RNA sequence: GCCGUGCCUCUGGCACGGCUUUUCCGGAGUGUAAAAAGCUCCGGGAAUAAGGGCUGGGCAAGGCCGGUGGCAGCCGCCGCGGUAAUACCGGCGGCCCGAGUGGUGGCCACUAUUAUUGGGCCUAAAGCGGCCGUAGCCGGGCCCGUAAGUCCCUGGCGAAA
RNA sequence: UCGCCCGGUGCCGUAGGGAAGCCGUUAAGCCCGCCGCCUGGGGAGUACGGCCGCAAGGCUGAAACUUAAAGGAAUUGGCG
């Protein structure tokens, strides 16, 4: 696991920090992904992710969900723009969706692909469905639901070794976060891949708004973040 | 109303045309050199089966619901599929290749009977082999665990003699 | 809108009422119950039929088209109507002659209806004299009766 | 006469008010013209 | 991974409620005391609700 | 008019938990709404409560500890088997102990956890989780 | 059909050597009310045995060559063709299933487009112009009875397939 | 003239809801009830039948066929 060990170690030297964070993470002050997060700090530098989780750049841990072309009227013409959408993630706890525009389709992948980084979130993984009783970081620990535009979005734990049924883009997302086994029931138009690709973040995200007991943790198996790498 | 049909013992795919399925089958089908589709989705077919019954009998519980556990694990792993001190959860963690490799083609090739895997199928074909005093004539027959270890050539095969002129190409590799 | 008009207890009379009611508000119920596909269709819910044909046609295509397609007027024999039928392929019009026998089948479009730029045809020719057409277009066979 | 807001909109067609009038004149022809 | 509670989730002074990656949360030494960490949810400084330092007693915003 | 005064209840509490208050008044009092707050605190979503009379029918001070994500009723009543639970569990909770499931069975109200160990059924009224 | 060694476009085709006999032809038993199939044995021989639909997007697979010129034709839907066609018609490559593979009609899922689970009604389909009331569905708090609904235990039943 | 409680009538606006325009204790929010209506666009509010009105007219109301869009809320321009 060394190879993405030397870009962090080359990264770390020739990058002059310009936020607090980015002075914290060269200082040796903060030196673990996961802590962050709770506290209100911003992310406005894509190398404290470089650093911090490097294998986030392997180009299998990248996506590109969907790429389109649209257009503006002008007494001269057509005015054409691009729109990538991309989602980054190491296959662990941690997971990434941004958008990003440009005149070509190449620099518009690379914004894209820019922007995912600074739009991450860790989420809880687990196992609470009927069938398969086990505790192992597997699937959705419990029931959650998010929107965005007119998509609904369910996701339902289910039992170990059963795919991922959800739709095409869904997969993508979800096994970029870690997950491998769920369920699914949507409402709305699952037409437009920007909207049901956001619902599906959404979820993700939400999984960490239900109150729960500490008796619930050791029996649903729930980590938060990497779980023994 | 209408009387009893008989039924396919398989089932085919959803859509036809996803590129990463056809992948992933296009590699067992040289792998094991099965002769066509409709004889991989069989076994699919068999451990799916498997795995739907570990699904009810996990969440279920009464006095009968107890007896039809433990007959699952009793034949399961008679067939060699789990070792003897397997509990139920491991059901759900089997896959496809621990089916494929108990076809009587792999294990007379795992068992050094045959000098490639498109050579044990003639061998079994043509009547050269024997399971248990008996000779079997059908590849994709599913070898039990207490007789994986009593086949040989038939007592009247040409196979059975050390100075067949084919049968010293096929100990010529085992070193 | 309050909540849902019967959700009590000892509602099921009116709960089953209201359902049987707004279920003919349908189409493909409405048209499956009181059978009004029969008692109009020309070929009497079979999925082929027989007919001898009267006269060779052609029809215009549709708008944003250009180009002739080439048909026949087929005359039932279970029945006795007349229909109007499509020759499927290249040049196959030069193989049905006037007092032919010819097969019909639909043409296979939306909601059982026509397909295409030939909008108002809903049916095509397969077989001339007991021979296939498919065949006698492309070689490979030849015609009888002459 | 049981009519719908949907077809005072105008756009590809001519003016309601004047098709509920025409429409009437036919109503009327059958009847009289033995509608017996 | 070496898990000795690798880690532990902040939780607001208030209602509890711990805390998710990316909300508008804050935290700060207690005021008049100097010996407490206090943490405000989003929902709990929109709506300015009260909090009181566990140590000593000073009240609210 | 009013027809139920413990959907009320129970819909004033998950109203109210949810911008942040810490205390309620569920205002026309039964006794079933007692009962079922006291199952309701046995398993920790509330705090402690009190029985006060106002000459009519009496309120309920009640004070809430931010513990729970939804409460509501069961309102067609429907019954329940004793072997014929997990058909409703799988339909309003959201894994396979989330929370519990209150029914009326013929001792008193209870959890469906504690009717599946006697082995008897009856009518559902609510659910918390 | 399989195995070994060489040559080449290397997934496959050839040249040399060897092997087997499920299937194929003759023959002897067993089988069958009598036959026939099947099954166990002999003697020959790689000898007797691959189609159908697709190749622009949905949807796996070609930007290769010759024809035709808004004419022939294709097209479930969107859409191709006007003398420079990856979309029609032929050649040669390739892809999917394979003793099958395509065409037309019917029912279910797709469809939360019949909605109890579980949809809508300001502007998209859709709140009666307004109000009074009969049947029916829905109905405030406590105390004492009954045991019809409901729940648990137990006898007789709900044919075989 | 100032402050407070109850009932009507207006505006700016949190949480939340919505495809948006925008609604927001006088909900288009979260709940418990009952009734009326809706099911791609046309054909058509038509034909045939019934009941009311002195007439003009009201109320109830289909199918053969035909079509791939018809509708809504907001963007950049071009234009008056
Ligand atoms: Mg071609
Ligand atoms: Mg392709
Ligand atoms: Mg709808
Ligand atoms: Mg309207
Ligand atoms: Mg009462
Ligand atoms: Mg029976
Ligand atoms: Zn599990
Ligand atoms: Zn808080
Ligand atoms: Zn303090």
Known sequence: SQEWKEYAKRVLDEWQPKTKLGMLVKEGQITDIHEIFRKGYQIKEPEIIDVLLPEVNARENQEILDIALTVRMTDSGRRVRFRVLAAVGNRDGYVGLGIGHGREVGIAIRKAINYAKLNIIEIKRGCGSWECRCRRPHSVPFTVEGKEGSVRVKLIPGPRGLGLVIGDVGKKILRLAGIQDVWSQTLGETR??????????????NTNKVVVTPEMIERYGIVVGRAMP | GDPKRQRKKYETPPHPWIKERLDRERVLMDKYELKNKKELWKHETQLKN??????????????????????????????????????????????????????????????????????????????????????????????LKEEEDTITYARTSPFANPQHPERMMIEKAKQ | PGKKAPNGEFAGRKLKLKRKKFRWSDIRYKRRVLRLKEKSDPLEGAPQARGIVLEKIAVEAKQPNSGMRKAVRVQLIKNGKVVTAFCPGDGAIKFIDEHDEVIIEGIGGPKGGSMGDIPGIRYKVVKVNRVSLKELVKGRKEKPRR | MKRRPRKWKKKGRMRWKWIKKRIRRLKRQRKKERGL | ENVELKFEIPVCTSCGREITPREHATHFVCPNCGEAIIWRCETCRLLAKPYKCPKCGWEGP | TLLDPLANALSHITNSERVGKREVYIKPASKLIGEVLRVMQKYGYIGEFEFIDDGRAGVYRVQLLGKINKAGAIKPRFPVKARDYERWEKRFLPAFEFGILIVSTSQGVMSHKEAREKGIGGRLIAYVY
Not at chain 2, 65 to 82: N, S, Y
Not at chain 2, 93 to 120: C, F, H, N, P, W
């Open chain 2, 50 to 143: 498997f795995r739907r019954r570990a699904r009810r009998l996990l969440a279920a519980r009464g006095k009968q619901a107890e007896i039809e556990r433990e007959q699952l694990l009793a034949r399961l792993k008679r067939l060699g599929l789990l070792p003897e001190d397997a509990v139920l959860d491991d059901v759900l963690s089997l896959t496809i290749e621990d089916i494929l490799e108990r076809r009587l083609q792999t294990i007379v090739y795992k068992k050094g009977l045959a000098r490639t895997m498109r050579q044990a199928r003639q061998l079994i074909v043509h009547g050269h082999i024997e399971v248990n005093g008996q000779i079997i004539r059908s590849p994709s027959y599913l070898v």
């Open chain 1, 192 to 205: 437009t891949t920007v909207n049901f690709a956001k619902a599906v973040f959404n979820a993700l995200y």
